[PDB]
Amino acid sequence: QPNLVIIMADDLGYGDLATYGHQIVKTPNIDRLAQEGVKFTDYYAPAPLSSPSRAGLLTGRMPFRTGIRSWIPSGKDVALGRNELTIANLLKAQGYDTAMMGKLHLNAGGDRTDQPQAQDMGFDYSLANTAGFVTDATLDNAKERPRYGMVYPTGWLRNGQPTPRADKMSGEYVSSEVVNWLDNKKDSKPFFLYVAFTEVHSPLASPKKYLDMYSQYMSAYQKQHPDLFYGDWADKPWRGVGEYYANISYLDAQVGKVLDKIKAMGEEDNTIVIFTSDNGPVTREARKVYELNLAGETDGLRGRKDNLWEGGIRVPAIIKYGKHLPQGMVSDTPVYGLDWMPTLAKMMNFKLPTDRTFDGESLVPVLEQKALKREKPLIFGIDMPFQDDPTDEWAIRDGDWKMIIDRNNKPKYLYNLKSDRYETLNLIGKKPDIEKQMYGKFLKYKTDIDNDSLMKARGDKPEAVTWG
Amino acid sequence: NAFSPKQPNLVIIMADDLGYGDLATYGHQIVKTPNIDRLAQEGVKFTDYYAPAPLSSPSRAGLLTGRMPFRTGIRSWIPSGKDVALGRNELTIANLLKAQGYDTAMMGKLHLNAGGDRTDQPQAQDMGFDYSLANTAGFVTDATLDNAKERPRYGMVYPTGWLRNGQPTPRADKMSGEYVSSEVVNWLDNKKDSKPFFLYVAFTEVHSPLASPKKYLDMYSQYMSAYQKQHPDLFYGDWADKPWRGVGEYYANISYLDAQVGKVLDKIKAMGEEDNTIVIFTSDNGPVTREARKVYELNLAGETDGLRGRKDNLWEGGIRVPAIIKYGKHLPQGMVSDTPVYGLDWMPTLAKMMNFKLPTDRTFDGESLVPVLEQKALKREKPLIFGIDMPFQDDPTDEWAIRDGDWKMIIDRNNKPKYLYNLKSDRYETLNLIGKKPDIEKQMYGKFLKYKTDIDNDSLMKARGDKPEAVTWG
Numbered sequence: 001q002p003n004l005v006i007i008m009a010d011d012l013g014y015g016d017l018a019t020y021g022h023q024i025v026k027t028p029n030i031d032r033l034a035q036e037g038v039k040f041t042d043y044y045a046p047a048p049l050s051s052p053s054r055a056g057l058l059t060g061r062m063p064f065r066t067g068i069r070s071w072i073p074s075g076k077d078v079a080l081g082r083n084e085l086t087i088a089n090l091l092k093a094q095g096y097d098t099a100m101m102g103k104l105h106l107n108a109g110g111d112r113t114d115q116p117q118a119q120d121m122g123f124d125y126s127l128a129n130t131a132g133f134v135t136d137a138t139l140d141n142a143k144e145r146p147r148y149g150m151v152y153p154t155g156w157l158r159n160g161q162p163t164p165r166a167d168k169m170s171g172e173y174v175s176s177e178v179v180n181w182l183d184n185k186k187d188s189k190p191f192f193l194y195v196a197f198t199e200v201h202s203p204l205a206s207p208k209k210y211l212d213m214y215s216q217y218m219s220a221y222q223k224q225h226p227d228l229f230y231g232d233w234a235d236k237p238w239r240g241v242g243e244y245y246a247n248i249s250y251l252d253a254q255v256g257k258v259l260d261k262i263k264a265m266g267e268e269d270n271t272i273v274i275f276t277s278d279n280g281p282v283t284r285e286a287r288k289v290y291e292l293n294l295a296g297e298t299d300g301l302r303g304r305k306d307n308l309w310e311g312g313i314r315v316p317a318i319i320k321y322g323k324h325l326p327q328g329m330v331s332d333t334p335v336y337g338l339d340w341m342p343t344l345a346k347m348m349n350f351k352l353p354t355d356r357t358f359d360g361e362s363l364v365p366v367l368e369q370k371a372l373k374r375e376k377p378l379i380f381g382i383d384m385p386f387q388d389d390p391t392d393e394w395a396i397r398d399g400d401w402k403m404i405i406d407r408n409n410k411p412k413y414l415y416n417l418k419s420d421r422y423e424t425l426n427l428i429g430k431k432p433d434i435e436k437q438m439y440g441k442f443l444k445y446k447t448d449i450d451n452d453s454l455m456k457a458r459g460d461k462p463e464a465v466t467w468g
Numbered sequence: 469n470a471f472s473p474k475q476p477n478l479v480i481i482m483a484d485d486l487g488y489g490d491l492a493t494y495g496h497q498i499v500k501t502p503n504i505d506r507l508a509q510e511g512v513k514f515t516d517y518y519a520p521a522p523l524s525s526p527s528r529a530g531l532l533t534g535r536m537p538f539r540t541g542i543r544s545w546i547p548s549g550k551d552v553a554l555g556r557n558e559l560t561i562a563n564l565l566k567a568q569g570y571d572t573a574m575m576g577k578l579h580l581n582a583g584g585d586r587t588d589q590p591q592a593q594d595m596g597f598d599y600s601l602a603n604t605a606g607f608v609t610d611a612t613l614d615n616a617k618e619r620p621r622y623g624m625v626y627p628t629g630w631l632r633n634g635q636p637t638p639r640a641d642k643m644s645g646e647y648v649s650s651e652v653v654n655w656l657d658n659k660k661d662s663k664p665f666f667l668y669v670a671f672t673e674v675h676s677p678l679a680s681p682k683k684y685l686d687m688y689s690q691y692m693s694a695y696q697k698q699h700p701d702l703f704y705g706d707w708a709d710k711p712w713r714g715v716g717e718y719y720a721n722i723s724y725l726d727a728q729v730g731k732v733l734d735k736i737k738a739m740g741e742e743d744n745t746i747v748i749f750t751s752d753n754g755p756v757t758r759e760a761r762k763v764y765e766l767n768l769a770g771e772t773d774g775l776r777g778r779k780d781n782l783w784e785g786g787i788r789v790p791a792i793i794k795y796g797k798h799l800p801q802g803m804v805s806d807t808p809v810y811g812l813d814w815m816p817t818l819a820k821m822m823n824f825k826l827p828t829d830r831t832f833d834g835e836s837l838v839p840v841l842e843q844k845a846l847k848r849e850k851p852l853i854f855g856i857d858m859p860f861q862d863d864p865t866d867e868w869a870i871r872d873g874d875w876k877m878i879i880d881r882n883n884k885p886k887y888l889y890n891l892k893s894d895r896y897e898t899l900n901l902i903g904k905k906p907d908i909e910k911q912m913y914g915k916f917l918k919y920k921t922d923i924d925n926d927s928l929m930k931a932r933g934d935k936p937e938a939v940t941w942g
């Protein structure tokens with residue numbers, strides 16, 4: 001009965017790792033992970049934003065089914081559906097020691113008794129940030145302007161209980177917790193770790209070591225003001241790209257610390273490791289005041305975080321399982337976050353519930369070097385109103401064809417991705433019969449999603465996002 | 469109960485799609501621009517200079533006439549076979565200097581008419597240039613690659629279809645930057661008179677298609693993808709279905725431009741004209757970034773120093789571009805100015821610097837920058853005005869922007885305010901103040917509508933029998 005470790009990076013772009021082609025950043029640990037496992041070049045997140053993507057991946061269900069369509073606003077009634085089951089829920093029922101450390105972002109806050117929390121979601125141990133980003137209260141509530149100091153996480157909960165201000169930056173705070181929990185394991189029970197790193201989401205916080213690696217990529221202003229709090233960046237000169245790269249290398253190091261602990265404890269050959277990201281990056285294209293001075297890369301792919309174009313949804317993914325998988329295999333088979341649930345059911349020898357719809361397919365055939373026969377197209381969504389450039393709402397991927405649907409059920413884009421990698425040759429009005437086939441397939445999938453039985457069972461309905 | 473019953477020479481060097489962040493002297497952390505960095509070191513560098521528009525043709529029309537480009541009949545792109553061109557009665561800096569007795573010449577990108585064959589439209593000669601080697605198009609074509617039968621196609625781009633004094637040329641034996649710089653150098657050699665000169669050197673770099681010699685590609689080998697290294701001369705017409713090339717080819721093209729600017733500047737100095745030549749180096753609009761919107765925009769890497777938007781956009785990154793002026797030792801050397809200035813300012817600035825008078829029969833939008841160069845404060849009597857008429861875009865573009873002090877308002881294509889920013893507190897345009905600043909909103913929208921009416925009812929436009937024509941072509 002194999003252990004499972006799912007390592008989730010935050011806003012990590014498709015081109016943000018050396019093994020995915022980044023020409024500057026040093027990511028030795030994740031690069032080695034890819035060499036020892038299977039790396040996917042055509043893997044997608046279920047959504048181009050944190051909350052629906054994470055909900056999708058943990059449930060095996062298109063996020064709209066689970067009640068999460070985009071951001072989760074403070075004080076409102078948006079959370080993961082009460083009757084939803086996560087990988088953790090199912091593995092607990094198989095007799096697993098379950099734990100999560102880091103970003104949760106599946107409810108409106110840790111103090112909400114009317115909403116599922118980490119334990120309800122199947123994690124028997126948790127060090128959790130319920131929010132979408134790291135806060136340091138000592139920087140937020142500081143009186144002077146400008147504010148100087150590196151960001152140290154406040155407001156996290158260990159097993160539902162308040163914690164002191166961290167004495168490590170977020171990545172180390174997460175990884176030390178993971179290593180400690182593994183150090184203090186009671187028995188020989190199989191474990192499931194969900195290591196949800198907050199890197200590379202704003203606010204970036206990196207130790208000097210990683211910062212020094214990219215001093216060429218810092219602006220003169222950054223060098224004069226390296227500790228400048230991001231809350232004070234709106235009216236300041238550009239910082240360059242080095243702080244972003246530093247943060248990537250810091251993440252890499254903390255991933256390495258988790259992987260080194262698995263190997264040291266004698267569990268390499270018994271542990272399934274999945275490394276992925278929840279959505280495409282924040283690039284140089286900042287849309288919000290909390291998005292400044294970042295430098296995510298998409299390997300040329302169109303769009304970024306928020307967007308249903310490739311660079312918003314295509315993300316790194318690597319799977320390793322001791323010596324049981326082909327080492328250093330690279331797969332270009334189209335796969336996505338919703339596939340993990342059936343994959344792990346098969347790999348870990350548990351049955352999926354049959355009282356609910358799952359959207360994904362087992363990837364075991366891909367790992368076994370066989371064809372993947374996919375019955376359904378890949379389906380993506382985001383419900384993000386009030387954007388300066390209006391977002392689209394749905395995307396469907398079927399073979400080489402990809403259709404993007406606007407916030408009014410109208411096809412806005414149609415691409416053949418094999419002849420148009422960068423989504424610059426819109427085929428709407430040019431391919432009438434492919435248009436009708438793809439639109440028909442969209443309506444059938446949308447209808448199935450909107451009429452989801454499990455969502456009906458909890459007295460819920462698809463609710464359009466009306467909030468910001 | 470209620471119900472009871474010796475005149476100075478002029479060289480204007482215009483780069484194409486060169487971004488605000490694209491030069492080392494503007495903070496680029498990778499690219500080597502020794503010649504342009506030196507120009508800034510020897511001159512006045514503006515950090516808050518704007519092009520008149522976020523697209524080639526209206527920007528260039530604006531700069532050359534001192535008039536907001538819509539007044540001149542150019543609102544965005546110039547398609548072939550249509551009637552979009554610089555208005556017939558418009559005068560450029562070249563027309564004015566021709567009448568002062570200048571030897572006037574133009575080399576490189578024109579992009580102010582629908583083609584060199586169009587006898588119904590003003591050409592380079594009509595615009596006041598007595599000598600020209602011109603590309604009338606918005607981009608370089610190499611017919612040999614365009615017409616090649618094999619797919620994919622391999623070969624570096626050599627300019628075809630350029631006109632020397634109205635006449636066809638053979639395919640260039642040098643890539644565009646060198647084709648231009650060589651023409652400039654030869655013209656400066658072959659001239660006989662001691663008449664003052666005006667050179668408009670309109671480089672095609674860094675516009676797609678990129679074309680750079682091996683020397684410059686080698687400078688950036690680290691920044692080339694594995695695929696690029698295996699397929700270095702792959703033709704850009706065949707990039708749509710191929711792996712990313714990395715960012716090295718873009719940097720190479722920047723350094724190539726820099727060397728060609730250097731060649732021209734070296735010639736000015738070598739012929740003994742450094743002390744008596746005004747040199748303006750600028751760009752026509754913001755860059756094409758990693759944010760590709762079109763099949764001809766792939767594998768590019770323009771930088772905006774973090775500023776919002778890019779080419780096409782009215783946000784800072786689409787209109788703020790590099791600008792350097794040098795005039796021998798007549799100007800403060802190594803000066804850096806953060807006074808907001810723009811392309812429409814050049815006409816009255818040069819009128820003062822070069823001692824000619826502006827025509828009194830037409831509206832001009834800019835103001836003389838002589839006070840800035842004399843290290844005094846500049847007071848504007850008009851807002852800075854920008855526009856672009858670009859329909860059918862995937863993310864709809866906005867149409868106007870006005871700038872007054874630290875305040876910037878962007879107007880959508882339905883004539884409605886969409887954004888209001890204080891650039892002093894919000895460099896990155898992320899804090900929209902629409903519905904948060906009632907007095908400022910009223911002041912700025914009022915200033916806009918006044919400026920819009922004045923532009924729409926331009927007298928010179930009326931004099932040639934024209935009107936503002938909304939862009940309905942693609």
Ligand code: NA
Pocket residue numbers: 010011049050201278279
């Ligand atoms: Na995220």
Ligand code: NA
Pocket residue numbers: 285389759863
């Ligand atoms: Na955009």
Ligand code: NA
Pocket residue numbers: 484485523524675752753
């Ligand atoms: Na241009």
